[PDB]
């Protein structure tokens, strides 16, 4: 069968939040190193890619191989029934028509068990045409978040411009023009505090806003986030899921 058992249930839930509003139905691929999730959002613009590795679960086990076709909203109700010390455990038979999550408690003895129904899908693994991007920004995830939320009240679009020393976010509305600017981190300190740019040649791109705002759902997962940018190639917002893997959001520029 399949029995992936994470010590810190919270994690999975967080991940649900990071997707939930983007994708309304996903197939979790299970194999010997772990689960992997590939989907193109409701409106087919952004792309989610999720990895979760065997070594990170307290107990991993995929004998055979599973495309689990879980609907995400339903799954979100279920996780939402967990607590934050709750031991999740997805479980499934080989061609299981159902996946079971089963929550235990560390300092209690209630034992939840929710079985949800699995769906069939086609799975369109468009690759991540791997490039070495022109500019890698690392920055505080909650900073990036505060930024994205703020600048949405002006434009529908965000201009992200990096140079060797700083990154700049900019928005123009029928209301006002707005410019937020981060300089780079003197003395490479705590990542909650650290802006660090590896800068080959300057990049300046426009992105849509609702999408940044949804990618920033993933903010709790890591206190850091990392925008990799090159011209004409999509943009990668990458949150580390903290030692178990990570989630990448892919978005195309405009203009």
Numbering used by the authors: 1 to 255
Please give me the paper's original passages concerning this structure:
Proliferating Cell Nuclear Antigen (PCNA) is a member of the sliding clamp family of DNA-replication accessory proteins. In most organisms PCNA is a homotrimer, in which its three subunits adopt a doughnut-shaped structure in a head-to-tail arrangement; this toroidal structure is extremely conserved in protozoa, humans, yeast and plants. The structure of PCNA is comprised by two α+β domains joined by an inter-domain connecting loop (IDCL). The inner face of the toroid has an array of basic residues positioned to provide favorable electrostatic interactions with the DNA-phosphate backbone.
Herein we report the x-ray structure analysis of the first crustacean recombinant PCNA (LvPCNA) and a model where PCNA interacts with viral DNA polymerase PIP-box as an approach toward structural understanding this feasible interaction. LvPCNA eluted in a complex of approximately 90 kDa, indicating that this protein assembles as a trimer in solution. Accordingly to this previous result the molecular replacement found a trimer in the asymmetric unit. LvPCNA had the cognate fold comprised by β-α-β5-α-β-β-β-IDCL-β-α-β5-α-β-β-β topology with pseudo symmetry within each monomer. The backbone cartoon shows the canonical structure and although the IDCL (residues 117–133) had poor electron density, the density was conclusive to include the coordinates of those residues in the final model. LvPCNA amino acid sequence is highly conserved among species and is structurally similar when compared with Drosophila PCNA, as it had a root mean square deviation (RSMD) of 0.5 Å for the α-carbon backbone. The central hole is highly positive charged as shown in Figure 3 and has a diameter of 30.5 Å, large enough to accommodate the double helical DNA and slide freely on it. A peptide sequence containing the WSSV DNA polymerase PIP box was modeled and docked into the crystallographic structure of shrimp PCNA, which is its natural host. However, this is a tight packing cavity as obtained by docking, where mostly hydrophobic interactions are leading the binding, the hydrophobic cavity is represented in a surface image where the PIP-box peptide is positioned and drawn as sticks. This pocket comes mainly from the IDCL (G127, P129, T131), central loop (S43, H44, V45, L47) and from C-terminus (F250, L251, A252, P253, I255) residues. The results from docking suggest that WSSV polymerase has the capacity of binding the LvPCNA in the same way that most PCNA binding proteins do.
